[model samples]
Target: STGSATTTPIDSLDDAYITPVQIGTPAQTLNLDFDTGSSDLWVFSSETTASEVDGQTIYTPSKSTTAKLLSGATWSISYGDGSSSSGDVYTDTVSVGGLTVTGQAVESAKKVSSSFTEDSTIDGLLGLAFSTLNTVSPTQQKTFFDNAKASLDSPVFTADLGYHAPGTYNFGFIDTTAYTGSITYTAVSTKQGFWEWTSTGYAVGSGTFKSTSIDGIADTGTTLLYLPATVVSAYWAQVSGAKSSSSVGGYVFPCSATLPSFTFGVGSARIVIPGDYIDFGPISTGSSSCFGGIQSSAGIGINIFGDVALKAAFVVFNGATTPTLGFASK
Candidate 1:
């Protein structure tokens, strides 16, 4: 009927909002990344080759009476950041929080890219993007939320992401108490099957919020905040010792750089990202070098509003008619 779960922070998030989800009969609990950037529910399972499933808690379909093979269906997916996975399909009962959906398609991974294999904390990915983005060929699969939405009180979900802290993911309802101030709305453009929208404008630090439009997606899977190259350069110019790094990649600077809070515009509302968030932590043990969280979305025209930018505000991924995004101060 309803669902709500607290997300766990893995080393100050590292741009993740992982949650525990139950799959199949007898309910095997798995910690999965609730990614809003892609579609497809996949898990490291017994079906996966022994060498491919290192460190991840595997979901053995044979152990669940309700699980059934989707004979010919298969899925292969690659992320923008190069993480990839491919597997055969299965139909099983899936539950998040207390809400359950029987026969939801679950892809059992047989192969995974180095990214997934290296991230030992992430057992699998639970996609929240539109069902259209599902990668299961021959027959596309519906997301857990897609199947559960029909029975929901209101087909909506809210994300209360926080800075270096845990947060909440609520389904079919919005908790008025979770945020302060009004939730200014903006129409979401989904042509790319992403929760994308053009911002009214933005400002670096206490600078004026201009009207220059920037197109981007609210991606929960991406690890850093990516803006236009010109905009990124402008932001870093204010900090001394800040420069692009070939060895470390992205931008790097002295740990003591005077970082300032950046502000993003959402129609008339603004979400201010604190200075500390842009500093992604030390480059090495006790080193004076640190990575900057903001990077250039140069070759990739679409900017990515990753967790570094998201955790500063209360985000509402409104799936109600037409799909609107609501952002406000936490």
Candidate 2:
């Protein structure tokens, strides 16, 4: 694999879980995991002080009186699994469903991990992807698309990963009334962030590995989808039985059956990835066998495509005129 242990392979599984969008104003819904690879939006703070935190999700700025706190500004983050946290900065009035974004810029950690200090059910991370991994700065910074881009109305921002049901990831505009066809974009690269691109080849059902041409990087702060070990040994050689023991180092087929349906072309589009996300496996308890998808990078420099290829399309992350990342079909 490329380095720091790799793992990428995905296909459905309820469109790869993670949803809980409600913020402030009498509401404080938080069930986040939505990340495009860092942009800063951390949560987890009952006031924080449980020897740091873990398992994440904790917000309680008194339920937001308007929420504010950026006296000196300080935040720390380190994940690739090394796990780390430290925080300060605050500024609120952030809503998500009906969409509201006043000052919005939160990070309140105080140190984390006890599964997020014992979890109370989501209360952090809502980075709408971009800004090249912002860490919050200058008097509380700003992002969630710079305050929902003036209330979304329309500038385009859709990520509908609902494969068969509960799949609605919309932000700002781009609803176009739910898919009527025609929307291909792909052109972002000003550099700062959202610098995505890479996917030389990949396929499962019909086989078709294609030696080694990987370069994919569409991380939602990564949650799986790492391919590289010669495309995971050419996709378990077509999974007739598939076997790659070790438990969680990488590769572990057999989610009962029905796998093999993957696809990832990325340039001319082709995303696909539907197989019930290869059966999630290991949510915790004993932990080890986890492969709703995996490849374990071999030349790794950058090969993400997390959220398992972003819940199967409908992803349009246009950075409001400049950095582009479009893939239609709502």
Candidate 3:
């Protein structure tokens, strides 16, 4: 008996929608973005002026019928895109999929921007990542996993993104039937709380791509894969007649005809990048640029394997008992 539902879009973050989630009995749903980038649960508050909290979903304590505030403490949140919001601290009963968890720590935003306010479809975000990366902190910080772990039957969570779109994201509970064998797990790094990996490099067609010694993080929160310039340039060079065009973000390339089949190596796992994701439709620039799938990150230090890669495999974030991540073919 898994809970299933669709989320309303509140706003756009890197082209994805930030939706609202109803928690508590009778539903004390708050607008939230299901973010893997950051593990934090927050909502818009009554103290916020209508203007500031425009498009945001306002959680009315009075109307909730079972609402409770977190006293005088205040909260603030900032996104990678420079977007931010803040509110007071509050505690309330939160529920999802018939699973009810009480005293879930949350932030109620009092100040919001027009970008967030304009997005009416979504109310808030539900972050399904590890708690170590949670944005909410206190003398004793907690995350969605921290609260749901005890009550959840399997102590596991699975996200079903197949319904969202081509790039849909899912998490929780590892469905063993979906894979060939037990899910292979990698140790979680304490520094960033992201799934780190030792990439063996990438390949095109049947050629064995050279391995670049680098650290990789499986980040569903991030949209695109960010690799070092050397690796990106090397991979792009393999695409026959592929040229670096400035039009669509720097990594744009020619039509699909110019590119070849490609795959990435993560230790023993070899995942392929489909042609459609590579042959990004031509923009107005006339030049056919490979889609923005593989691009240079200037020098971000760590290579991020985004949702595009995750979609090709079954990933499990075991935050309940062990701080590790498991992956297998879907």
Candidate 4:
């Protein structure tokens, strides 16, 4: 079995991407963030408090005859961004594109933070990371990918995120036409419940590649690329008028500054991120300074190749006996 879905950026910054998913018996369609960094398929639902509900869609399990509550099961999760959500569990029929999974664990949100309620573009999140990261208590549940892996044509899922355009997510198979060259494969470590891997090195603009090990995670849920301070500083130093701003809370530079491209190595492959992608957006409306899409991962404890990096390449999450990651230029 397989599935395919189109993902669209919610804003001009490409801060996040979302895809449509159908849930329950009658099929309540909601746009969800297909996050590869987390492992809990949660959603805004009828159980959520009234005050917490805004312009978002809600899943009403009572409307679906196939929905069954997983009694005594509950979940709560907090993100690095400080946003959080907690909920009870339900088992229901869920489908993405043409792939359907009966009795998929559907966590119905009972409470959500202001940030989630404020962002109306996404109703919830569909986790694509390993099931080991699931936060459900008493009985941890399998992620969507894990639940469908046995029946898949191939135990794999691929992400083709775009800059300001629509991209695709394919399950159980890879579309050769989506990439320009042969994929470079690398080992993946699920130790931290992330698609973690180490890169050969990185180069700023057309500079020579630095041969060093740079460990990081390929996180679709995160918005920016975070790396060691030394590397991030080296990249920013090449741009005039760029500086770390305590006020803006990150590195910022003149909107008109000509930014240099960023390149990272995956095995023998080189994936280049366009300069424009690093210039996130203006710090404020009509502001002349813009925030950077790349930042230092000093305190975060882990370097993350977020949307900024993911959008530049085709990534594969191969769920084999020993998982591997594949990257290719598109």
Candidate 5:
């Protein structure tokens, strides 16, 4: 084995998880969100037009001794929220924690949508979904994790997300001290560049767990758990004063409402997501209404287990052979 696990500190900006990543030779560092929903390591760059760039700290290739453009290759990508960015491709030295990857594809932004420019703090995305999802043109590219996995002691990564608090993302190893009990493992279907899996059943509060197979993906990029409209309605129905009214849009409930715990089947294990955590706080500052952290995925089709649901457990993303996910209590 080359070495053990390396853990990187992650900060929370409400809904997103930001981790420090160093790029280039002199090491210009940027705080990036490690997203598992998409694959493409793009950054706010010096190539970005002045008007399109806002408060983002851009990565300049001129300052990096090891940076080089891929010549004919270019890239552009869009999000579910309609935010998009485009740029030329560059190969450079990239590092996260103490792990360094040479010749990693780094997408340098030349143009970005107004929504991305306005968000400011989210400098860029470090996609961990799957290398197959990378948006580079002329040639598909491997992600930082994909390039570095060969040399890692174990070809795996772990996501430890906390609520309203900081967390850690571990690579090439699993920190035994960070979690408890045996990890309940499940096989994953990566055909769509997502960590897609099936659930045997689910239960609201202490109700009977129904055996309805549901397909979902574990996505760190998304903020909420997007499930079927039928499931969403079932959940909100249990919460007192909670309404699925379009008035507030989606599902809304009283600020003081007590929500029921949600449990889902993972193979033979039943993982529970706390009720209080499902209440995503008041809609706005001091508002009497609160939004449900779980919403309907009517438009998206498939379900996504975002940070709202992931925070309840510790996960191991084992990429060795057939990719599998192992979960345990935090």
Candidate 6:
């Protein structure tokens, strides 16, 4: 079986993407971030702290006849951004697009951080990374992808992320029409519970390719591209007014500066990210200083090819016993 769903950007900056998820018997619809960096399918629910609840749509398990409490089960997770959530667990029928899982573990949020409460547009997160990373205690729960993979024609899912536009997630089979050129496959290391792979090298604008190995995770949950400090510095130096600013927390440049495109190698294929995508936007409305979408990963401990890079091409997260990743130009 195959299932397809549309993923829409939450804001003008493309900070995140939201996909519709149906939970429980009556199908309580919620827009969730399909995060590839974490492995816990959590949601804002009836049990969430009332004061923490704002404009998010809440999932009420009581209204669903199919909902079953996973007694003694609990989960807690913290993100790189420092935002967090914790909750008890329940099992229920959950559906995404046309695929349905009969007893998917659903972490109903009881407590959430201020950042989550402030983001009024998102109801929760649906983790697509390995189930090994699941935060559930006593019994680690499989992700929505893991649970639904058995019924899929192929145990794989594809992400066709867009640049300031609606994208798609396809389960079971690859959509040939979604990409151009041949796909280049690379081995993935699930040891970290991420879609971790090595990039061959990179190029700044029309410069020559530099042959260096950069290891990173393809994370859909994150918003920017994070590479080594040297690489980031190399890219920014090419821009006339780019400089690292402690106050802004990263590199910022003149809004009027002509930016250069970035290119990274995946196998023999090179994917180019347009310069406009890297500009991010002004640090503040109407401000002349613009934030860069590519930043140094020195403090992050690991490099990350986030939405900024993912949107440049078609990506495949193969969930075989030993997973592999595929990339192709779109």
Winning model by lDDT: 6
Question: Ten-residue segment with the worst summed lDDT in candidate 5?
Answer: 1-10
Ten consecutive residues with minimal summed lDDT in candidate 2? 1-10
lDDT (CA) for every model shown? 0.86, 0.62, 0.60, 0.94, 0.84, 0.95
Alpha-carbon lDDT of model 3: 0.60
Better of 1 and 6 by lDDT: 6
TM-score of each: 0.97, 0.33, 0.79, 0.99, 0.94, 0.99
Off by over 4 Å in 6: none
Tens digit per residue, CA lDDT, model 6, 182-285: 99989899889999999999999999999999999999999999999999999999999899999999999999988899999998899999998897899999
Candidate 2 per-residue lDDT, tens place, 243-287, comes to 666555666765555667777765655666766665566534465
Q: For model 1, state the Cα shift of residue 285 in Å.
A: 3.4
Model 4 Cα lDDT, one tens digit per residue, 217-313: 9999999999999999999999899999988888999999989999999987899999988988899999999999999999999999999999999
Model 1 Cα lDDT, one tens digit per residue, 103-159: 999899999988788777888999998889999989898888888888988888777
Candidate 1 off by > 4 Å: none
Residue 262 of model 6 has an lDDT of 99
TM-score of model 3 vs. true structure = 0.79
Sorting all predicted structures by lDDT, with the top scorer first, yields 6, 4, 1, 5, 2, 3
Tell me the alpha-carbon RMSD of every candidate. Answer: 1.3, 15.6, 4.0, 0.7, 2.2, 0.7
Candidate 2 lDDT at 90 equals 73
Scored by Cα lDDT, where does model 1 land? Answer: 0.86
Per-residue C-alpha lDDT of model 5 across residues 1-330, encoded as one tens digit per residue: 222222232333246777888999899988787888888999999999889877888899989999999999999999876889999999999988888899999999999999878867778899988889999998999988889899998999888887667777888988899888778988899999988888777899999988888899988888788889988888888988888767766798998888899888888888889887687777787999988888999988789988878877888888888899888887
For residue 229, model 5's alpha carbon misses the true position, in angstroms, by: 1.5
The reply for model 4, stretches above 4 Å from the true place, is: none
